[PDB]
Enzyme design. Structure first.
Site: not given
Ligand SMILES: *[C@@H]1O[C@H](CO)[C@@H](O[C@@H]2O[C@H](CO)[C@@H](O)[C@H](O)[C@H]2NC(C)=O)[C@H](O)[C@H]1NC(C)=O
Ligand SMILES: *[C@@H]1O[C@H](CO)[C@@H](O)[C@H](O)[C@H]1NC(C)=O
Ligand SMILES: *[C@@H]1O[C@H](CO)[C@@H](O)[C@H](O)[C@H]1NC(C)=O
Ligand SMILES: *[C@@H]1O[C@H](CO)[C@@H](O)[C@H](O)[C@H]1NC(C)=O
Ligand SMILES: *[C@@H]1O[C@H](CO)[C@@H](O)[C@H](O)[C@H]1NC(C)=O
Ligand SMILES: *[C@@H]1O[C@H](CO)[C@@H](O)[C@H](O)[C@H]1NC(C)=O
Lengths: 100, 596
Positions: B357, B487
């Site tokens: 991140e 997904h």
């Protein structure tokens, strides 16, 4: 409300107070600036959680008009201690000299 | 008095004014995730919908311009980044009813409810705990039982929704000048007008297949060698020269193969280099792991993170008396205030995810001059790629021996480097062929070639081509074989995972060009090397206003899809697999089944 729309830039010592719609198209905008027409002075939209250059900065920048006019404002030019009975090079209120 | 003037005017408005609303939405979702309370859910009930509505209104008022003759090209880039009207493009009723159907047919899959006919008290949930009963189940038949129960419990109702969705979603984008709705995310970064740095929507499908000729000596060898180590736990169910059943993997279909690593270690006498013992010393916390990460982040050349990150996000424990979310997510909040949604503790995986991140934050801040609608990566799969390669660089043995994690005198073991290479490979290069084959077939189906009654039978036939996943028994049109992935239920952008993996290690290679690391590869930090930081500085700033492959072509040297970096990353691993494949076979005899 920092301004975002104006016809041109600002001249030296020129202040803009009218919120004129920034017309760019030859088609008249008129009335409420809606379809392809918009108001000036976009808001900051600031919040207390931003980066560095995203916060208000106060400016009292000086632009003194030092023309051929006599200078009213001057320097503080503070004083020194007062000396008595012995020789000094006094410079009282402009008039210079030397004495006791 | 022209198109250019008003176009530039309203887009100069839009950048800042919509960055404001995006920042509002980001802070709302942030407050929810950090503080799960009664009314923080409302933080999303007014953020995403208002963002979509503002996008739709701005697109509607923006498409009145020709947006073609304007001299600037970035204006069209954000305009073509604005023309995603979404939802209703052909008809309101059909598109909106399909979207509302999705709204419940995605949560029916996300519910994860399993009602076993034997006993209802045992259930299978889509949580990671399922990996302990499917990916890492102790009993051999328990994995098969879990797979069959999961399928028969979740996929019964998933057929008609998927069929109707695929059938009726084509014309929505076909009226949107997109060949099928797959063109929405296959050619997101497809730009014309300028040669050399351009893309073609149909180029991706044709370039998928022919680029794996040199991948096969690596991926096929890895598949064959590891298969020889699956025989010690699956008697009479391996056939190393052929294929393996779908329940003998770390993923139910073949995405992850790393959960077999503990069984398939090359040499088990020596463990991989681990940093957990290092935290035995003083127990590096998030506020300290983040600081010690700067040893290979300050010395790079690029600045630190945002000054507001270290004052708003939690450091020790978001729980306390407050429910919170600390999942791995790449966050771009905007307005110069970027932060990390993760708390880092004593764990090698937490250490890795800590840097993901923050590298994402560095990437995002490196192109602050980009337009707001263009403040993303080169495409879907490039924003997260460089953000995560910094995470992948945390477990670097040549860098672990610098900050007390490992003493800088222990010699690298015979196979520990190869051990780590094989362990990591089964997750990244053992997953690329999934998108190479199944996603390519999915795009071909989206083109419309498969008829109404060939969706399930043909999956088994074409799974006998590249990936090599076989099943003991096929099934008729009564199960949910093909579309049963998290997904694949809502046409998720798999290019964000495709160009991610193809363009994966080229970024690290470009990092190491001026770092003088020729002997050891696949592990090399950019510490104490300003040239490495300043040569991919263009990579972290290209964004979307610049062409997606400007810094990529200027620095990496591979404008289009590249095969060499993947083989060079696992070059010691590739050589080891090609050398120790003796007394076995490399290819897969797909025409084989153990059940029959
Ligand atoms: C980058 O350069 C720095 C500065 O010279 C070095 O980091 C230190 O190196 C000394 C050895 O001279 C060791 O105590 C540690 O590896 C580092 N100490 C501190 C306090 O930072 C090293 O050459 C490079 N840093 C790396 C490789 O992490
Ligand atoms: C999106 O909506 C606008 C407004 O009706 C329309 O002009 C445009 O053709 C639509 N499609 C795209 C791709 O912009
Ligand atoms: C963007 O527009 C400016 C004019 O405002 C122009 O000078 C510049 O070349 C344009 N850039 C691109 C990449 O088209
Ligand atoms: C990085 O340096 C900047 C200087 O502007 C400052 O915010 C701080 O010293 C550092 N920020 C960090 C470590 O987050
Ligand atoms: C935020 O979390 C704190 C505890 O950390 C608690 O007051 C509550 O859950 C939240 N505060 C609100 C909703 O005002
Ligand atoms: C590693 O082990 C092999 C035996 O499998 C042998 O060549 C030697 O002991 C080691 N090789 C190297 C290069 O260290």
């Amino acid at each position: 409300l920092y301004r975002l729309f104006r016809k041109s830039n600002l001249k030296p010592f020129e202040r803009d107070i009218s919120t004129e719609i920034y017309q760019a198209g030859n088609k008249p905008c008129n009335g409420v600036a809606g379809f392809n027409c918009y108001f000036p002075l976009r808001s900051y939209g600031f919040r207390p959680t931003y980066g560095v250059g995203h916060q208000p900065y106060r400016v009292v920048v000086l632009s003194f008009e030092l023309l051929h006019a006599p200078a009213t404002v001057c320097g503080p030019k503070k004083s020194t201690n007062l000396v008595k009975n012995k020789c000094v090079n006094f410079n009282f209120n402009g008039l210079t000299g030397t004495g006791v | 008095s022209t198109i250019e003037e008003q176009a530039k005017t309203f887009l100069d408005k839009f950048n800042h004014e919509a960055e404001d609303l995006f920042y509002q939405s980001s802070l709302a979702s942030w407050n929810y995730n950090t503080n799960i309370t009664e009314e923080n859910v409302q933080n999303m009930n007014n953020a995403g919908d208002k963002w979509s509505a503002f996008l739709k209104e701005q697109s509607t008022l923006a498409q009145m311009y020709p947006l073609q003759e304007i001299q600037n090209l970035t204006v069209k880039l954000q305009l073509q980044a604005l023309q995603q009207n979404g939802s209703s493009v052909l008809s309101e009723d059909k598109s909106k009813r399909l979207n509302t159907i999705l709204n419940t047919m995605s949560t029916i899959y996300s519910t994860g409810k399993v009602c076993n006919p034997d006993n209802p008290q045992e259930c299978l949930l889509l949580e990671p705990g399922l990996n302990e009963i499917m990916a890492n189940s102790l009993d051999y038949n328990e994995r098969l039982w879990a797979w069959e129960s999961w399928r028969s419990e979740v996929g019964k109702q998933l057929r008609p929704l998927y069929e109707e969705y695929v059938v009726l979603k084509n014309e929505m984008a076909r009226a949107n000048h997109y060949e099928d709705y797959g063109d929405y995310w296959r050619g997101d970064y497809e730009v014309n007008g300028v040669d050399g740095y351009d893309y073609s929507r149909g180029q991706l499908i044709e370039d998928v297949e022919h680029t794996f000729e040199e991948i096969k000596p690596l991926y096929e060898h890895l598949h064959a060698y590891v298969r020889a180590k699956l025989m010690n736990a699956y008697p009479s169910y391996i056939s190393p020269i052929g294929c393996l059943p779908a329940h003998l993997l770390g993923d139910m279909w073949g995405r992850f193969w790393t959960n077999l690593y503990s069984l398939t270690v090359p040499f088990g006498q020596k463990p991989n280099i681990d940093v957990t013992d290092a935290m035995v010393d003083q127990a590096w916390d998030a506020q300290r792991i983040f600081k010690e990460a700067e040893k290979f982040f300050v010395s790079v050349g690029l600045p630190n993170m945002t000054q507001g990150f270290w004052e708003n996000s939690m450091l020790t424990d978001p729980g306390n008396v407050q429910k919170a979310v600390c999942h791995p997510t790449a966050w771009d909040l905007g307005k110069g205030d970027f932060r990390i949604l993760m708390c880092t503790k004593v764990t090698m995986d937490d250490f890795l995810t800590a840097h993901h991140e923050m590298g994402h934050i560095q990437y995002d801040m490196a192109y602050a001059a980009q337009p707001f609608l263009l403040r993303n990566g080169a495409n879907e799969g490039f924003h997260e790629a460089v953000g995560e390669i910094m995470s992948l660089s945390a477990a670097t043995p040549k860098h672990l021996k610098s900050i007390g994690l490992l003493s800088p005198d222990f010699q690298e073991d015979n196979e520990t480097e190869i051990n780590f290479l094989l362990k990591q490979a089964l997750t990244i290069v053992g997953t690329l062929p999934f998108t190479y084959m199944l996603e390519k077939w999915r795009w071909m189906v989206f083109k419309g070639e498969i008829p109404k009654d060939q969706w399930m039978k043909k999956w088994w036939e074409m799974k006998r081509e590249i990936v090599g996943v076989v099943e003991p028994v096929p099934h008729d049109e009564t199960y949910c074989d093909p579309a049963s992935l998290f997904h694949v239920s809502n046409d998720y952008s798999f290019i964000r995972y495709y160009t991610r993996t193809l363009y994966q290690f080229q970024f690290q290679e470009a990092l190491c060009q001026a770092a003088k690391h020729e002997g050891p590869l696949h592990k090399c930090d950019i510490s104490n090397s300003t040239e490495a930081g300043q040569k991919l500085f263009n990579m972290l700033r290209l964004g979307k206003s610049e062409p997606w492959t400007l810094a990529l072509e200027n620095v990496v040297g591979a404008k289009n899809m590249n095969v060499r970096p993947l083989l060079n990353y696992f070059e010691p691993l590739f050589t080891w697999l090609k050398d120790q494949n003796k007394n076995s076979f490399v290819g897969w005899s797909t025409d084989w089944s153990p059940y029959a």
